[PDB]
Ligand binder design. Sequence first.
Ligand SMILES: Cc1ncc(Cn2c(C)c(CCOP(=O)(O)OP(=O)(O)O)sc2=O)c(N)n1
Ligand SMILES: Cc1ncc(Cn2c(C)c(CCOP(=O)(O)OP(=O)(O)O)sc2=O)c(N)n1
Ligand SMILES: [Mg+2]
Ligand SMILES: [Mg+2]
Lengths: 801, 801
Amino acid sequence: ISNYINTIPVEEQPEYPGNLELERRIRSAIRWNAIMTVLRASKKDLELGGHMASFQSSATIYDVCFNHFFRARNEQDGGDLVYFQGHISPGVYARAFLEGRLTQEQLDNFRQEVHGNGLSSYPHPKLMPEFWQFPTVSMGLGPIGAIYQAKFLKYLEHRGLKDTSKQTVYAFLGDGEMDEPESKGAITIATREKLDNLVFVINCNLQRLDGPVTGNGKIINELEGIFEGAGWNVIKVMWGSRWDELLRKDTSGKLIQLMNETVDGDYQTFKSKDGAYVREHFFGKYPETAALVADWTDEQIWALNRGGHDPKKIYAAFKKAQETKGKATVILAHTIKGYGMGDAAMDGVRHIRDRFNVPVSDADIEKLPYITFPEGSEEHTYLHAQRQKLHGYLPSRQPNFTEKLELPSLQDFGALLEEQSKEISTTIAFVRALNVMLKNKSIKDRLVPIIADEARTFGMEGLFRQIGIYSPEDEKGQILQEGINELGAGCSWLAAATSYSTNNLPMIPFYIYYSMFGFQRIGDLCWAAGDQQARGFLIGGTSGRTTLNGEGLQHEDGHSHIQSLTIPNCISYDPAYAYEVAVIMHDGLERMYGEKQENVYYYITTLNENYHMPAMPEGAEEGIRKGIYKLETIEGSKGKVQLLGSGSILRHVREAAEILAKDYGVGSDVYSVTSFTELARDGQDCERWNMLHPLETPRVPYIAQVMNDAPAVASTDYMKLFAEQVRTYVPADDYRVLGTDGFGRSDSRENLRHHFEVDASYVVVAALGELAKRGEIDKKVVADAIAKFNIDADKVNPRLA
Amino acid sequence: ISNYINTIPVEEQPEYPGNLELERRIRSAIRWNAIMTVLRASKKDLELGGHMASFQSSATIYDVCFNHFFRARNEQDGGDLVYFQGHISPGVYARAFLEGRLTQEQLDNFRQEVHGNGLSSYPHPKLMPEFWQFPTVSMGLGPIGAIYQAKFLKYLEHRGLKDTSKQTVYAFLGDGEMDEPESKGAITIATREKLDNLVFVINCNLQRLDGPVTGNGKIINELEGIFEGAGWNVIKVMWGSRWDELLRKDTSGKLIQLMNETVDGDYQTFKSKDGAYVREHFFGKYPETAALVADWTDEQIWALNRGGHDPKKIYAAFKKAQETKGKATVILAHTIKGYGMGDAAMDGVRHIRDRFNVPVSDADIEKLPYITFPEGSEEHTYLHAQRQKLHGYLPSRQPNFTEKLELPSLQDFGALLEEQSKEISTTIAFVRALNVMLKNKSIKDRLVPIIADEARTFGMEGLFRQIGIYSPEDEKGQILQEGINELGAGCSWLAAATSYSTNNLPMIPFYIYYSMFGFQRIGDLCWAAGDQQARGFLIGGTSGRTTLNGEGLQHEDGHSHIQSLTIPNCISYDPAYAYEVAVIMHDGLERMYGEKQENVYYYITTLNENYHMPAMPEGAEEGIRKGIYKLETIEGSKGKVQLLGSGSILRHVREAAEILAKDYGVGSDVYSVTSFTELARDGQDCERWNMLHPLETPRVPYIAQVMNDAPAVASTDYMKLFAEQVRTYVPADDYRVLGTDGFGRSDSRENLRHHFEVDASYVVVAALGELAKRGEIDKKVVADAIAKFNIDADKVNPRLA
Ligand SMILES: Cc1ncc(Cn2c(C)c(CCOP(=O)(O)OP(=O)(O)O)sc2=O)c(N)n1
Ligand SMILES: Cc1ncc(Cn2c(C)c(CCOP(=O)(O)OP(=O)(O)O)sc2=O)c(N)n1
Ligand SMILES: [Mg+2]
Ligand SMILES: [Mg+2]
């Protein structure tokens, strides 16, 4: 940790290239418009919300960037990728409006979007697909997402995919936000990969929402110490030019000491006082210091500003960051929260109007008007001149990539559609589908297989020889290995899955990991990924509660599908067979990267268990994509039932169907449910349409179109709700659901399949139980089956076990 | 960072206190038994799994701690809290067996626990409630969990609740694991809080699972750099004692420069070779280094070992960490993964038996026999003698606290059961409930309110002046303010929620935060919390998709309940009224901290919306607990329906009921569903039991004992699956569910509840639609309602919007 003064001495500070006075004129109008936007929304009294004090402390930092650094998307690259602090959006909206990119009506619709012409509270690409790019309001996700974005940009270059060398990734963070584990949790990665195309701009106003980050300490010193220890280039922007001659004057080194020894809380207090308090309490600590401002009007004292408010001091830091190579730079900008708001952080409105010399007369001020710069005006000229010199305006977003990809047809996945000689798993099927894609000229180099240490478990190690491991194992390596870091890998996946828009270069990621450590461990990023319109594939390997049998409690995933079904634009599947994964993967590619360019991403759970893989029934394609199709019908004169299964459990309900037919003469319809969730979504859609169109003929849910009314039983490797979610749509009077509710534990697949009551014997007993209720069979026969199958009717509910 | 040598010089290292010779024998026996355990499970060929290489690399570190450092739970405190690395469990089981705490049958039942006498793969309290304490296999959770456990212990001491001053928290981590953002993302807090009762012990064998952590780097240096930069005391245990002379006679400084410049990849290459190789490639790099070992035989060179394998080196670091105050300490133990296993890294195991001079014949080697030390043997005496000196054996866990608390009665919350004066929200109701508790003499100081920055949003800023904010606002402050760090807040919550077991001091944490950042953001921690038998309350504030109306996409929670229902021992509630919040909180208090000592934790979503809070209907208590109760029935001569609601949407369902009655003559039964999830679970339990007891009297779902068969409609601020989850158990033929499926956006509550098709208007059209279908009313009546209510029957499905 260095002294509590700027990192760059004024002697090494470059000349500021802009018109300081004209820029302040433009900056003040933006400040005013930002405040009017939030104030106008406030007037509605609809509890709309919005922030003001934050952008007030960082406006000048953004201002210098928009005028002298931020490159907009251009013919060569997507420009600088700016991860704007989410809640300073009113300021971004204020500038866009001034640039004529947003209308007055839109600003008046701030935080009112449902009707079509409003603005989102925060950066939400899904809501404003041509404006916002990176979802940052969920603190912590911005810094790590940016780190991996910077890394992915380097990847594109090294692979020779695109020259991203002129792109800088900027993460604008708050100091309170750095407390999130994800904020500093991955910073050593920027050093490892020498990400000199990444700049962290932490706005150090010393306060978070309900108070100061560390009132008893020095947050800027803590930040410096850890980022410096992490090998980052640290630039502290502490004081404005006014301090320059003061420090130069101080030969006793007492100012540095006072500055160094004063704690956050104190500094924050001074800020709420007056020149008198400072000179007395601050400067009054030592005579040597008091004697510096001794000849200072208290108003001269109170005039000393924090470095984050001085453009000249801000410019030096960004110019230096821009020049630095070999590592990432973090700029710690010292600011005042609620800067120039005084009263805050109509009398207060008159205050900021005066404070920033805003061009609004006393006759207009009560109208809370927005300010605009006419064409031909000095301000209008400069505002656009600076941006044009920087390639245009940002934030901006292109929702669809321009190129046409020549995707592999399903036929190209032929070998997977046929019966397998060897017993394999859906994971081996996945790796094989990847290889089919690796032979496709058009997308072969666009594929981005991602791993988090474990490859062997997923039999991914065979790909290493064919495509290599990105290791700037060389800079041309194609597979991204992120180590034991599920969040970081999800971030690389997000960078690749949204590359089609950000860089207009579609990249198709395939991130495979232990399914349990998916939505459960990185769920907030998965939700933000949907916001970011990510188009890619998340592969939850070693899935199913009873299939990853030895690992136990914190590994056995019998619910990721319950977690995944909560994301609107995530398409989840739990295939049982290899031909299904091929059909599913092919459909995803087509939907997402085909001409449709559907803003959706895929989640496919795959297995680590091998078994016979039959050939795809002819014409089963549409059903597989839809989520269900009848596998076969079995004859039986004693009765009829329908049996549904998915994943590794389908194999077991299929065995229950043979037992039922053989030992009980009960026939059945066997269905492979590739997606209980897509089927649930379809039923809901039909029911909603029906409810909304009372005079129209009721639409029939696909699952209801596929199934009949015979008593049904379903079993899967997930908790019962996974299959229960389609109850409303099952056309049978009876629909029993077996599932793996309860905490996992270590044992053999067989022992677990019995414990969780999802094996063949339970399916048979469940099927028999319904026919018994119908009067088709004697209750005694089901009671004997329970006995016959060594089933403990009185063992604790697995959910409780 | 510092030189690549041991932090502690020999002249400063203390005399080893134990019998190294005897200790090696015992250690070798534990090494053997651990491998026999995993190998024996392997023989079963049931894909049970288990690891061996990892524990082989860290065995001596644990051995020195078990012999001279670890304090077992005792009469005064819970002893040292050790977060044992997850996959080295075979080594912990091997020692427990040698200590006579585990039987050979149990070891023989390693990873086969479904039947009663087996052992879990990893540390899982829920599965082995009296053995394991902290769930660590999900990497990253243990380090951050440990930091907040150390902080909580301090908290207990500052608040005067318990002198935890003699307890040390050890987090045994892997170097690969440190890549998880959660691993280093919060190390800065240990310095902030001066956690000199926290010791991070990172096993630096330089490799993850599928390779080195950073082959082209030095993770020990990286680790050292960031931890020291974060203010921690870092102690490096690099080289064994054989290096001392070499380093001491090397006056040129070349050996250090060589050690310093060598990257991890080459170091690892050295251990796969032999002495000759090292002599040429490592020492042969320079004439001065080559000369240090010129007099050595390739064997004497091959014998040079890593510090983490030398008891004397290990001991010095743990001892030194023991006298370090004012901050936490990180011990970087340098080891060899797959140590002593050589080749591997039946009879091929005879190599390790040779390697560690294991006392088992080459004829019995194939039998994979366990080693034990007979009562009276020098080894047996020393093993137990060392432990007794340290208060016994660990790990061990106590499932229930011993003291009896005098919990508040429901009557004590009487004011909350009456009709409320002003319009308040369920969050105000929650804070008021907390205050009732804070007046209880028995539990007032056992309460642990936890907030992540935001307090005023939840009106918690009012408890500050009352109970204070913990600051070691003083050190006796009760409220834990964890800033913008949801994971850290949940870790403090976890430490508190399980203090009843680890310290036999029941503490009752109430963590309130923006619901969206609960399970979605810290779900892996939440799952581990259930594994750790956590007893506390998680309060999801500003919950509901349409209720936190202005915030939008990344804040509007309409699915946290779908995530929370995936955890078996978490009880979820979505109350609409203040009296319900009181009954649920009282019930949870009694269930968890009452005589019942039920291992479950609660999840209550609360609102930021104010509306009329009615008086609790006499006798509604049990129904509120169970999940549903009839609020009232409204008369209607034209038809009848059932209307269900929860949270903030219930009042709109009641509004729909009046509309139906007043505008259409349709009567209804209105139900308040406090917990759709608990009703589903109950129904699932009923049908499961029914299926398993076919000859017996069928069990009726509680919801079927409340509802009747009139067409039903339900609406909640959550996606449709939240209410649809009870379909199977709803006794009505028609059951329409309205929900907030889809991404959130900014707008007014009114506009949002209409966009998400969940307001009174949609409930009325849904109910009327059901009657028209029954021929009960004209289809034109529903069509006109849709018109009357300005409903867009053809707008896009909110899920797709
Ligand atoms: C994960 C998460 N937690 C909490 C919040 C709530 N929140 C919080 C806690 C804010 C305080 C921001 O403090 P900061 O120091 O990061 O930045 P500023 O002081 O510059 O605003 S702004 C905001 O929306 C959030 N958006 N995301
Ligand atoms: C969150 C998470 N991700 C992945 C794994 C899988 N995993 C991984 C990736 C291991 C490698 C351990 O590497 P390490 O360096 O932390 O430890 P050792 O070298 O001492 O074994 S052990 C293991 O079970 C896990 N348990 N938890
Ligand atoms: Mg701040
Ligand atoms: Mg390792």
